[PDB]
Motif scaffolding. Structure first.
Motif, mmCIF file in Angstrom:
data_model
loop_
_atom_site.group_PDB
_atom_site.id
_atom_site.type_symbol
_atom_site.label_atom_id
_atom_site.label_comp_id
_atom_site.label_asym_id
_atom_site.label_seq_id
_atom_site.Cartn_x
_atom_site.Cartn_y
_atom_site.Cartn_z
ATOM 1 N N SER D 17 0.835 -1.176 0.000
ATOM 2 C CA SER D 17 0.000 0.000 0.000
ATOM 3 C C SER D 17 0.884 1.246 0.000
ATOM 4 O O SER D 17 1.753 1.438 0.862
ATOM 5 C CB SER D 17 -0.946 -0.001 1.203
ATOM 6 O OG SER D 17 -1.637 -1.236 1.320
ATOM 7 N N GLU D 18 0.645 2.073 -1.012
ATOM 8 C CA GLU D 18 1.298 3.358 -1.156
ATOM 9 C C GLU D 18 2.691 3.147 -1.664
ATOM 10 O O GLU D 18 3.261 2.071 -1.492
ATOM 11 C CB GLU D 18 1.342 4.127 0.173
ATOM 12 C CG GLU D 18 1.464 5.660 0.055
ATOM 13 C CD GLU D 18 0.157 6.335 -0.397
ATOM 14 O OE1 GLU D 18 -0.451 5.897 -1.406
ATOM 15 O OE2 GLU D 18 -0.283 7.293 0.287
ATOM 16 N N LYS D 19 3.222 4.183 -2.300
ATOM 17 C CA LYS D 19 4.610 4.169 -2.692
ATOM 18 C C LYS D 19 5.408 3.976 -1.417
ATOM 19 O O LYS D 19 6.501 3.415 -1.462
ATOM 20 C CB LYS D 19 5.021 5.435 -3.457
ATOM 21 C CG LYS D 19 4.876 6.716 -2.677
ATOM 22 C CD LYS D 19 5.470 7.911 -3.416
ATOM 23 C CE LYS D 19 4.716 8.254 -4.687
ATOM 24 N NZ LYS D 19 5.261 9.514 -5.265
ATOM 25 N N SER D 21 5.019 1.933 0.837
ATOM 26 C CA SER D 21 5.340 0.521 0.818
ATOM 27 C C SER D 21 6.310 0.218 -0.315
ATOM 28 O O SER D 21 7.422 -0.251 -0.080
ATOM 29 C CB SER D 21 4.086 -0.319 0.674
ATOM 30 O OG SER D 21 4.442 -1.654 0.376
#
Ligand SMILES: [Mg+2]
Ligand SMILES: [Mg+2]
Ligand SMILES: [Mg+2]
Ligand SMILES: [Mg+2]
Ligand SMILES: [Mg+2]
Ligand SMILES: [Mg+2]
Ligand SMILES: [Mg+2]
Ligand SMILES: [Mg+2]
Ligand SMILES: [Mg+2]
Ligand SMILES: [Mg+2]
Ligand SMILES: [Mg+2]
Ligand SMILES: [Mg+2]
Ligand SMILES: [Mg+2]
Ligand SMILES: [Mg+2]
Ligand SMILES: [Mg+2]
Ligand SMILES: [Mg+2]
Ligand SMILES: [Mg+2]
Lengths: 63, 89, 46, 93, 102
Positions: D17-19, D21
């Motif tokens: 999840s998300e950049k 991550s």
RNA sequence: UACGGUGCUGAAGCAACAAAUGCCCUGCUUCCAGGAAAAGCCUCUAAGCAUCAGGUAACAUCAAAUCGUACCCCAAACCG
RNA sequence: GCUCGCCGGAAGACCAAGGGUUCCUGUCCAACGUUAAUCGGGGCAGGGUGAGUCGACCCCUAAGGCGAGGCCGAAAGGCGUAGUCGAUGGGAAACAGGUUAAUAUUCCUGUACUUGGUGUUACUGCGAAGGGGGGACGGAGAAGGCUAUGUUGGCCGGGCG
RNA sequence: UAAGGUGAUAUGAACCGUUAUAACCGGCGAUUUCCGAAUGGGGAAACCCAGUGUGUUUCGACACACUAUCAUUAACUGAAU
């Protein structure tokens, strides 16, 4: 799936026991959460299976 | 004979938003086709399929409630299958 | 100007919290009444 | 060993999840929702055994549930733990 | 037990199809049943490209009450009430009025 | 540069003078109103242990969990 | 974006207390905003809080609280010993730089340090809920030494209006 | 008892069952986190920390069990004397 293992040996059961978790349950969560697992009902059983597993073994040994 | 280095991904949408489905193959030069639960519709005003071969990207807009199924892509010998559910407001 | 409520949780809990309430026959009757009244927050604690 | 094999049900989900991550993928380490009572060392073990990878060190933080919606009353979500795991070198998954 | 049940053939007694026969599609725990070709309501459903639905008005069957149907005898050819007798430890339904086990 | 930004590259990098309410200072001088506690730390041994265990040093290695960490904070986020 | 104006011992900057997602990003403008609103600390959704070293927990105690027994009280209870709690004070240790849209003395690069366990190698009397030491402390005043910090010159790059 | 079921807002998904291990109802069991008389010590209730026992073909640290107080009885201990 009950009396099928009412008679399945205290030691032997701790095997499927792990095999429910060791395999199905952990793989299922991971695989599921990761958007794979298209057949969700597998999460319902397995969990419910372990419950059975632990109902015996607890009722076979000591109780 | 190729495979699917990157499968799809189940995504949610509030009827009207825009779903996204990506999938990389192994060899360029090709043209697969996406399909809900398993119905080959036809890129129209409500379907935005943009693929340049070596890559395939889908973009569904205001998805209805029916879209409640899985996005199974088909190409040469590759086959992906993500999860998609259309929720109302 | 400085008004009457000057918040501070340490004092809050020490003066009105569950355990404080519990430390006195009447403090306990406090709870008892609130339970009988079916109150959702016996004593506004963490 | 130290932690029973049973209790290596601490790994709960990847947090892809998300950049945040993924951009912190492309420079070592992976991140995951993980138990709640999990003990860094306890969760390193899980990642050694399962996942069969190497792990240098693990950092943890607790995410607090957002409270929202509703008219008069109110609804709150559950708290949960973050991973940030950092694999040694022959990095795979 | 339940008198009208799932795969049955029945004849309607009351209102707008009064006298229309049909087979029970399913039976809902509200005490209602959905019976084929009996109650038709024209729902308005939006067309969906993803589900490949044409859209526009569609025709479906609404749930009628269980007490508004009775199962069709077909030996007399009329509506008939249902009882329960025991035969060989099986609680079977039977038609009243000729007493025939279904 | 998608005009918000984002990359890349990269000179000199010294000296003199001034200079705090900061530091030296838990100091120094002086005065009367005569200026917490306990632990960590150091040392001393009793019972006790005397090849042991412990103690000191060098190097090597392993452990340091758990909980907090966003944002406002002389304020449009606190008491009003 | 170019001007203009205002604070600058603040109207800048970092926190504690208190709040508790108000942070960041997309999206919407009905209601909230004393107007409009494309904007918001407003709606919806997603993201975001990374520590051996900062802080809590922890060891230590002040005020004070609780208090086995105990003394006292028609009952409820009161006071208090041994203790046990209680920071507003004592107690080991990380800095300069970089990076995220959003955290960073926590992540990354460079360079460090603290205390225990275990092992090796030397060398050795070790050892307390105990003794002593230390920790350990007021007000005012006086300069000297010094840093932050500033100014100038030199140095470097650029300028010739 | 049964032909239909996977509580409600609440659709949907994936399922389960139809002549007896679907569901549902009743009897008896099993499991039963943490706080709370709370009882191992503490504490700003839902948290911090222990002593002792156990536990590891990866026998460290963590996990579990037990350890409050008063009364009665017993046993063993035992001051000034
Ligand atoms: Mg943390
Ligand atoms: Mg901050
Ligand atoms: Mg809000
Ligand atoms: Mg904002
Ligand atoms: Mg308006
Ligand atoms: Mg907002
Ligand atoms: Mg203390
Ligand atoms: Mg007493
Ligand atoms: Mg007292
Ligand atoms: Mg303090
Ligand atoms: Mg910041
Ligand atoms: Mg050694
Ligand atoms: Mg002393
Ligand atoms: Mg200087
Ligand atoms: Mg000129
Ligand atoms: Mg307790
Ligand atoms: Mg207690």
């Amino acid at each position: 799936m009950k009396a099928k293992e009412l008679r399945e040996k205290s030691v032997e059961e701790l095997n499927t026991e792990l095999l429910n978790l060791l395999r199905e349950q952990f793989n299922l969560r991971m695989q599921a959460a990761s958007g794979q697992l298209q057949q969700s009902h597998l999460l319902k059983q397995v969990r419910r299976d372990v419950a059975r597993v632990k109902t015996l073994l607890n009722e076979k040994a000591g109780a | 004979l190729i495979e699917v280095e990157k499968p799809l991904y189940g995504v949610e949408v509030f009827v009207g938003e825009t779903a996204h489905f990506e999938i990389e193959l192994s060899e360029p030069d090709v043209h697969g086709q996406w399909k809900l639960k398993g119905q080959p519709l036809t890129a129209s005003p409500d379907c935005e399929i943009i693929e340049d071969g070596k890559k395939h990207i889908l973009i569904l807009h205001n998805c209805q409630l029916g879209m409640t199924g899985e996005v199974s892509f088909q190409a040469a010998n590759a086959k992906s299958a993500a999860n998609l559910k259309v929720k109302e407001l | 100007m400085k008004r009457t409520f000057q918040p501070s949780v340490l004092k809050r809990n020490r003066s009105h919290g569950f355990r404080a309430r519990m430390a006195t026959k009447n403090g306990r009757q406090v709870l008892a009444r609130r339970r009988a009244k079916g109150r959702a927050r016996l004593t506004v604690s963490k | 060993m130290i932690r029973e094999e049973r209790l290596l049900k601490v790994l709960r989900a990847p947090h892809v999840s998300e950049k945040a991550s993924t951009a912190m993928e492309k420079s070592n380490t992976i991140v995951l929702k993980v138990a709640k009572d999990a003990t860094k060392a306890e969760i390193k073990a899980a990642v050694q055994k399962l996942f069969e990878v190497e792990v240098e060190v693990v950092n943890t933080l607790v995410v607090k549930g957002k409270v929202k919606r509703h008219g008069q009353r109110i609804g709150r979500r559950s708290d949960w733990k973050k991973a940030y795991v950092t694999l040694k070198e022959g990095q795979n998954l | 037990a339940a008198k009208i049940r799932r795969d049955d053939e029945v004849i309607v007694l009351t209102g707008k199809d009064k006298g229309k026969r049909g087979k029970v599609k399913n039976v809902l725990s509200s005490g209602k049943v959905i019976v084929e070709g009996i109650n038709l309501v024209k729902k308005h459903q939006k067309p969906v490209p993803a589900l490949n639905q044409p859209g526009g008005i569609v025709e479906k069957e609404a749930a009628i009450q269980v007490s508004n149907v009775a199962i069709f005898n077909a030996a007399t050819g009329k509506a008939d009430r249902v009882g329960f007798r025991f035969e060989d430890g099986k609680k079977v339904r039977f038609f009243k009025s000729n007493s025939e086990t279904i």
